[PDB]
Amino acid sequence: SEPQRLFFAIDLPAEIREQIIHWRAKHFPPEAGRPVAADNLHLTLAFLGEVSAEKEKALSLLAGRIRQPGFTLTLDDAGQWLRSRVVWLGMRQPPRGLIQLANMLRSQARPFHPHITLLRDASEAVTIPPPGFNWSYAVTEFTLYASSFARGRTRYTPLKRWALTQ
């Protein structure tokens, strides 16, 4: 069947997504770059690319084999990558479990730099304040997404999720 544009990701709880966009609006003018919609904020584990229905299944079945306890993410970090033109949110010392999860999903298919992108096309350097306070939460699952382009906007469609253990 049709090839889709796929990726595995960790999502953010709704309250934190809202805190993040309020903070973003407070510290970044619209000129600083193109803002990611609140529902589209996520932390990518592995970008897969265009994927046949065939190899979608083989990746889905192997993600199903992963046996990994949950972990907590605390977003204490923010910065900018000029070459990628992105302003991002991150964790200074991400938990072992996040790295192990991303690596397993990169292997079943540049090194892993877990981040959540806030602004795209941020070609100009800008001042990066620290993140807001207490953006900390338990990761309980990860999701396989398809990305389309609908009405000009980017849309992520959840295909499958897998609970992490705890």
Numbering used by the authors: 2 to 110, 120 to 176
Tell me what the authors wrote about this structure, in their words.
We also cocrystallized the enzyme with ATP and 3′-AMP, which are neither substrates nor products. The fact that they bind the active site can imply that they may be weak inhibitors, and it can be taken as evidence of a general propensity to bind nucleotides in the active site. Two similar datasets were collected with ATP, one of which has one ATP bound to only one of the 2 monomers in the asymmetric unit. This ATP molecule probably has a partial occupancy and/or some degree of flexibility, as evidenced by residual difference electron density. The other complex has three ATP molecules for two monomers; the space group remains the same. In addition to the ligand in both active sites, another ATP in the latter crystal form is bound in the vicinity of it in one monomer; this ATP is also involved in crystal contacts. The binding of this second ATP is a strong indication of a propensity for binding further nucleotides in the active site vicinity by E. coli LigT. Residues interacting with the second ATP include Phe159 and Arg6. Again, the α-5′-phosphate of the active-site ATP is in the same location as the corresponding phosphate in NADP+, and it is similarly coordinated by Arg6, highlighting putative RNA recognition features extending from the active site.
